[PDB]
């Protein structure tokens, strides 16, 4: 929803997560991503334990 | 015995440490690094085009 | 740069956490310093932490002086005496902590 307020698509391929869009992301966008990957990760993590 | 009980608070710092690398602020300020790079490498390839 | 970076932001965040550490035990400023640039530095390099490697080996519990510690070794071998340095063998190779 934050993504697509500045024009970008985001593809899930498999476990991973791009924003597909017309021009490069922003430097907030891409930190956004790369935060919610992580936070996948760890949730992951968190279920197994 | 206070000691030990400290050592094994800080070892179990890692995953404090962990969560920290996937929280907002430290991700805003490692996108900008690669923003920054990333810039300067995009500049000097259409330089050299 | 982006060691760098994680090795800053851990030594900031680790200084906090170990300042009332560094405060309540003046004593064991070394070895906290020494756990310290160990968190550091597998927070930059990844490397893993073994937490037997930095554990505290305390070696005897503590004594209250009344009644004194008193220790007879009827038997006065070399290990029973001094200690032994135990040894751990891993696919044949020796390494201990």
Redesign the interface.
Known sequence: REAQEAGFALSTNGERLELTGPGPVPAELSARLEEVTLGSLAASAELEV | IHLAEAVEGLLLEVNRLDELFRQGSFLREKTQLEARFKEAREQQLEALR | ??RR??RD??LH??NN??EP?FQ??PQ?RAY?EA??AR?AR??ETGEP?D?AQ???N?LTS?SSGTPPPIVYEPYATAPRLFGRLDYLVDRGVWSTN
């Open positions: 740069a982006l970076l994680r932001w851990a965040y680790l956490r170990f550490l309540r035990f064991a906290l756990l310290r968190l597998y927070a932490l937490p930095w554990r505290p305390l503590s």
